[PDB]
Design a protein around this ligand. Structure first.
Ligand SMILES: [Zn+2]
Ligand SMILES: [Zn+2]
Ligand SMILES: [Zn+2]
Ligand SMILES: [Zn+2]
Ligand SMILES: [Zn+2]
Ligand SMILES: [Zn+2]
Ligand SMILES: [Zn+2]
Lengths: 259, 259, 259, 259, 259, 259, 259
C-alpha cells in the first residue's frame, strides 16, 4: 500500500518501511495495532511506537467527518451437510408445510446459510426498534419467500424499493408460511413447461420481524404499513407483508426440484 | 459476620479485623475483591493482600464440590406508569385482543414488570436448547395466562408439577392468545357474584417459547409433548400448551377489574 | 418508589432505606450511581456500596434481554426571541422565499425550536446510513412542510404510515423549498373565508436528508423511492418527496398570519 | 420561562416549579448549574439534583447537532474620562499624526472603547492563523479608519463584503496611519459647508493584523491579497489594506470636530 | 534530538540520557508523556518523573507566547478500489452528471481520497461560522472543480488569493454540479489536439459550504460575496462561486481520460 | 539530598527516609507534593502527611524574606527542520529583506529557536508596561540584530549595560529591519578576508517592543530614550534603537554564510 | 501517643482509637484538624467531630496560661551548587572584598544557607522595631563575621551574652565589611602553622540591622549602644558593632581554605 508509505514518511519514520514491507502491514492493518502489536513486529523503541499511535489517532479521530476508515465485507454461503440437524429441521419445514406444480414433495438438493455482517446489523437494529415499540416483543417468525431478486438479496439484503407493486396487499415484500404459497410465484427458461420437473429453482427461508401485525381479510393496496402497526397479515393460507426492507433477513437459501 | 472472623483468624491476619469491621466487609463481599479493591479499603501491605486472595482462592476453587459460595436473589416488581409507551402497548393488547363476564373492555389498575435473574437464566437456557433443535428459531410468543399459583409463579417461576391436569389438551400449562379466554378461567371471594364488577383480578402476560408446535384439532390427554415437538397448539380461539415449566417466563403482572 | 424498597430488601440492606428516602433515591437514579455518588449521600461502608453496585449490575446486565432499564423523554419547544439572529434568519427565509391567499408577506407571530432526543437520534442514524451509501454526503436541506399531523410530528416525529396518498409523486412526505408552496396546503375553522387574514397557521421548517435524489419531470405514483435513490425531486417550483419518516427532522415550528 | 416548565414537567419534577419561579431560573440559567448551585437554591434531595443534571446533559450533549444552547451578546461602549492616561495617549496619536479642511488640530469631544466578545474571538482566531503562517508574528498595528459603516462595524465587526470597491488598491478595507488621511474620506448633512467646523465626525482607531504585507508603489486592483501575503502596504502617506474583515478590530470610537 | 539533551541537562537528570537514547525519546515525544508513560520506559523513581513533568509544564505553558510546541502534518492520498461502494458512487456522479470534447463517458483510471488534518479543521471551523449565521445550516454540497493549481490544493487547501480573476462572476473559486462543465476548463501538453483521448486529466470532487447563496442570473464581477450572503449561485448549467478558500475542502481526486 | 534528611529528622519522621531515598525525593521536590502526591509514594498514614505538609508550609511561607525556595533554568535551542513552515518564513525574511560583502543571497546553515522561561517573563512584563502606557499597543516588531555578545544574549538576555556606546543614535541596542544592515556589523577570525565566503557568522532575529518611538532624522547621542517615548526610530535604511535591555527577546538564532 | 489516648478517653470516644492509631494521629496533629480533616480520616458522625473539636478548643484556648501547645523546630542547612547564581554572588563578595596569611584569594569549598524559623521571626521583629524608630529604615546590610561560637549561632542565633568583651568598641558583636578583616580573627588545631593552607575555616555572611549607627573614630568600651543609636560604626577598614543578639541573622555558612 502507498497509503502507509505516505503516512510513515509524514511522521518521519521512513526507516521503518522495510519492517512494514516485510510484515505486509497496510494502513487498515496499522490502524488496529497498539503498543503490544507494534512491538511484536519489531518496533522496539518507545518513541517510534508513540509516534505511530498518535499519528493513527490524529487520522481516525482527527478527521471523523471525513470518515477515512475505509476498511472484507461480503456474503459467505455456508453449505449444510444433509446429515446435519439444522438441515433436517429446515427440510422438515419445507416438506411438511406443503399444502405451481402437480407435486406432493420436494427434492432438496442443497441448503446453504447466508452470513452477512452488515445485513445482520441492520436487521437487529430494526428488530430492537420494533421491540421497543411493541412492548419488548419483536414477534419474529421464519417464513418462505420467492422473488426475481434472490441472488441480489443474499448480497445486498431485502429492498422495499424493489417491491412487488402488483400484489394483493400493496407494494410490500411478501412472505408465506407455506412453501407452496411461495413457489407458486416462481416464473420456464429452457423447457417451456410451467411445471418443469428438471428446474433448478431456489427459495429463501427468511427471518421476518412482524411486530404489531394488522389482521386484514380483504384486499387493499397499502404503500406503507397501517398507522401503529409494523406489518400486514392477510387472509383473503395466510400471507405476511412487510414494507421495510431492513425488517427481514435472508437466513437460508434452499435449492430444490419439483418431485 | 463470624465467617470472616474465622477466615481472617485462620490466615493469621486478625489485626485487620478493625478494617473489616468498620467497612462491613463480609465473606460474600471479600470473595469478590482483588488487589485494587483490597487496597481501596486500606490493606496497604502486599503480603496481607496476597494472603487474603490466596485464602479466598483456596476456599472458592479448592472446595468446588462443596459449593461454599453462598451469595440477594428475588423478584423485583417495577410499576409501569400509565403514560409510558410500554404500559400503553400492553393495555392495547389487553383490550383489543378481547373477543367470564358480560363485559366489553377492562379497567386496567396497574401493570408491573417482573424481574428475576434466576428465572431469566432458566428461560434463556431452555430457549437456547429449543432454538438449536428448531433450526435456530425459538418461536417465541407473548400469551396471557391465569392460574391459582400466580403469586408463586412471579417468585419461583412456572412449574409443570403444578399442571392443569384436568385440561382439554392434557397436563400442561395453558396459555391463551386472547385475554378473554384467560379471564374465563378465573375462580368470587367477597361477593357471591361470578361477574363481580369490583373484583381485583390478576393476569399474567408471559413470554412463551413454543419451538415446533403440534397442530391439534381435537382433544387429547398428553402428559408430555408429542415426539419431535416442543409444544401443542390446539384449536378445538387458539390455545397453547407447554409441558416444561422453564419454557415460559412471567413477564408482566396485570391487575384490573371487569368493566 | 417501591421498586427500590424491594431491591434494597433483597440485598439485605433495608437499614439504608431512611437515607434512600430522605435523598429521594429511586431505582432509575440508583442505577447510575457509583462508589463516589453513593458515598456522597452517606453510604460510608465499603461493603454496602459493593453490595448495591453488584446488585445493580446483576439487574441491568444480568437481565439484558428483559431490558429492565425503564428510564423523562419528550419534546421541549424553545421560543426564539424576535431580536435573535436565528429568528431573523428563519424569518428571512420564510418571507423572501415567497413566490392560498392574495398576500405578499407574512406576519410572523412566534418561531419555536423543536428539541427531541429520540427523534434526533433516529434522524442522525438514518443520515449516517444515507451518507455511507452516497459517498459520504447526506445531501441535507431545510424545507418547509405542512400536514394535518403537526402537533404529532413535533412529538413522535415524521411517519410515512401517515403518507400523502393523494399526492402528485406518490405516497411520500412532501416538502417544498418555497414557503408559499407549503402554505397553499393549509385547510377556515371559525370563519368561512379561505383567505382568512386572522388565522393562526402553523408551518414546519424541517431538516430533510435527500441523499441521491431522482430528478422526475412528470407525475408518477411511487410507493417507495426508485431503486438506488433515497428521495424524489419533482419539477412538474420544485417539490421534494421522502418515503421514510426517519429521514427528516422537525426543526422549527412557525406560527404566523396572512398579511 | 415556559421551556423550563416543559423540561421540569418531562422530568416529572413539576413540584420544584415554585422554587424555579421564585428564583427566576430559566433554561439558560439551569444549564450552567451543578450540584452546589442547585443546592444553594433549595433543591436538597440528591435524587432531584441528579435528575436535573442528567436531563440537562441529555439536552446539551445529546443533541449537539441541534445546538439547543441558545444563550447577552452585544457591544458595550465604555467612555474614557479626559483625565485618563489612555484618553491622553489616543489624543496624542490623533493630534500628532496630522500631516479635508484648513485645520491644524482637532477638538476631541469623547473617546469610547468598543467591547464585544464575539468580534474579539474572531479577531484573535485570525490573529493566531496569521501568526502561525508568519513565523509567530502577527505584525499588528493600530490604524485609523473612516467608512459609511461605522455604527455597523462597532456592532457586527468589519466586513469585506462592504468593501471599498472604488479604491486605489482594490476592494479591500483601507486603514491609514495618519488621522488626516482618514478624515479626508468623510462625506455635509445640515450645512452645505464641506469644511464644517461644527460637524460631529466619528473616526475609528482600530487594531489591524497586517501579517506579511505586500509593499506596493503603484496602483492596482487586487480583489484579494496577493499570494503569500496577508495585507497590502501602498505608498502612491502610506495606506494599509486588508481584504479580510476578521483581520481588524474596532478598538476606539473617537468623536471630534474640525478646529 | 539535541533538544532533549539540553532539557535533561538543565533539569540535572543527565544520567537518564541512555534511557532516552535507547527509547528514541525526543522532546516532541517527551512533552506528551505522563507518569505512566514515563514509568513504562523505566523511569522508576518518583522524583525524576516529577522533575521531568514539571520541566515540561514550565516549557509548554510557561512560554505560551513563544509557542515552543513545534510538533506529522501532511496530505495522505488513500486510493480507492474499483469494487468499493464509494468508488462506484463517485463514478456514478462523474458519469451521470455529464451533459471540452466530443465524448459521452469517461475512463476512470483511479479515485483517491484526500486526508489532511489542518485543512479539515479549517473547513469545519468555517462551516460552524456559516452554520451559526444561516440558522444552523451549512448548505453543504459536493461539486466538481478544475484549476491549474490542483497539485497545490490537495496539499495547502483552497486559496482565494489564487482566484479566477478572469471569471464570469468575479474573482472567486468556481465549482460545477456537472463534471463536463468542470472539464471544459482544462487547458494539451504532449499532443497538439485539444480533445486528446490519451491525456491523464485530474479533477477534484470537492465539498463546498454555500450557506446563504445569492441567486444571480446575469453576469457581474464581485470581488467578495454580496452582503448578507456566503456564496453566489449564478445561472447565465448552474455554477457556484465561493470567495473564501477555507469554505471548500478537496474531498476526492479523480484521474481519468476522455472516452 | 542532605537537606531532606535534616528536614525529616527535625520533624521526627526519620523512618520515612528509606521511602524518600528510593524515590529520590529531594526538598525541591517535596515542596510541591500534597496529600495525593505523598500517598502515591507510600506515605499512607494521615499524621505523617499532615506533618510533612505543615513543615513545608512553615518553611516556604514562614521564611518568606529568606526566600528559601531555591529551585532547571536555562536556554533550550530547538532546531527547525528546513522543510518546516517556520523555517521557510524566517528564511524568506532573511533573504528577501536584503538590500559587508558583494553577495546577493545567504546560505542558511541552520535556524534555532531560543527558549528561556526567565527572559520571556522579563520581556512580557516590560511589554505589559509599555502596552499600558501606549494605549494598549506594545508596537511589537521582529528585527535583525548583531552584537559581539551573541552567545551571551541567548543565555542571559539583552543587556543595555553592554550598550553600543559608539553608535549613531547613542548608547542603545541597535536593531535593523534589513538583514544586510545587520550583517554589515560583523567584525575575520581564520581567513584574513573580511568578506570570507566560508565563515559561520551568526545573527539574531529578535522580537522587540518599540512602544511609542521618537522619529529622528539626524544623529544624536541619547543615553536614554527621549521623554515620553520608549524607543528611537532613526532614518539618517531605518534602524531601531532600544535603551532598555528587557524590551527585546532573542527569538531565533540564524547561522549562515555569505553566498 | 498516650496523650491522645487520655484525651479521647476523657471525651468518651475510645471507640475511635483504632482510627487514631492507624492514621498515626497525635495530639499535636489533632489540634490542627477541623471538620474537613476529621472527616477525611473517617469520623463520619457529626456528634463525634463536634466533641473532638470542642475538646481541643477547651484545651488550647481554655488553658492559655498553661501554654499546653507544645508542637519540628531546627536549623536546615541548604547547600548551594557552585553553578548557582546565588553561590556565584556570595563567592564574588567573599573574594573581591579582600584588601591571617599572605594569601590573595580563597578556595571556596561549599556555601550553605541557614534556614531557621524562630531566629527569622526574632530578627524580623527587631527589624520592625528598629524600622519604626528610624523613620521606616532598618539600614540593613550583609556583613561577614567570625566567632568561636559558629555551630552555636546557626542553631540558637546570635547572643550578646557571648559578647566579645575584649573588643575595640566594647562588649558587642563585631561584623566586618571585608572578609579579610573577619578571617584575621580565626584562631591551628592540627598543624602548628597559624597560616595553615589546608585548614577548613568557617565564616558567616550574616544579615545585620544597623538602624541609626554612631560614627566613631576612636576606641571606647561601650557596654550597650550609645543613646538614640542602634549600632556603632568604627573606623580606627570599617567595622560594625551590634549590642543586641536579635539584631542580626546568620544567613550563609561559608567553608573555605587559604589560597
Ligand atoms: Zn426446465
Ligand atoms: Zn367481589
Ligand atoms: Zn377566520
Ligand atoms: Zn455642518
Ligand atoms: Zn495528450
Ligand atoms: Zn573565514
Ligand atoms: Zn593543618
Amino acid at each position: 500500500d502507498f497509503s502507509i508509505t505516505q503516512f510513515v514518511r509524514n511522521l518521519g519514520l521512513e526507516h521503518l518501511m522495510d519492517i512494514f514491507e516485510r510484515e505486509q502491514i497496510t494502513l487498515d492493518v496499522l490502524v488496529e495495532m497498539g503498543h503490544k502489536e507494534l512491538k511484536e513486529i519489531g518496533i522496539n523503541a518507545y518513541g517510534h511506537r508513540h509516534k505511530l499511535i498518535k499519528g493513527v489517532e490524529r487520522l481516525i479521530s482527527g478527521q471523523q467527518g471525513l470518515n477515512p476508515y475505509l476498511t472484507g465485507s461480503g456474503t459467505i454461503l455456508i453449505d449444510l451437510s444433509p446429515d446435519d440437524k439444522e438441515f433436517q429441521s429446515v427440510e422438515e419445514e419445507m416438506q411438511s408445510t406443503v399444502r405451481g406444480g402437480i407435486f406432493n414433495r420436494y427434492n432438496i438438493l442443497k441448503i446453504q446459510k447466508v452470513c452477512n455482517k452488515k445485513l445482520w446489523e441492520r436487521y437487529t437494529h430494526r428488530r430492537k426498534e420494533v421491540s421497543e415499540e411493541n412492548h419488548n416483543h419483536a414477534n419474529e417468525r421464519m417464513l418462505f419467500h420467492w422473488s426475481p431478486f434472490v441472488n441480489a438479496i443474499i448480497h445486498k439484503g431485502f429492498d422495499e424499493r424493489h417491491a412487488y407493486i402488483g400484489g394483493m396487499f400493496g407494494a410490500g415484500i411478501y412472505f408465506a408460511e407455506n412453501s407452496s404459497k411461495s413457489n407458486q410465484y416462481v416464473y420456464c427458461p429452457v423447457h417451456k413447461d410451467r411445471s418443469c420437473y428438471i428446474c433448478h429453482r431456489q427459495l429463501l427461508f427468511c427471518r421476518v420481524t412482524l411486530g404489531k401485525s394488522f389482521l386484514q381479510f380483504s384486499a387493499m393496496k397499502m404503500a406503507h404499513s397501517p398507522p401503529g402497526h409494523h406489518s400486514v397479515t392477510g387472509r383473503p393460507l395466510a400471507e405476511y407483508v412487510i414494507y421495510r426492507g431492513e425488517q427481514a433477513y435472508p437466513e437460508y437459501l434452499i435449492t430444490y426440484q419439483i418431485m
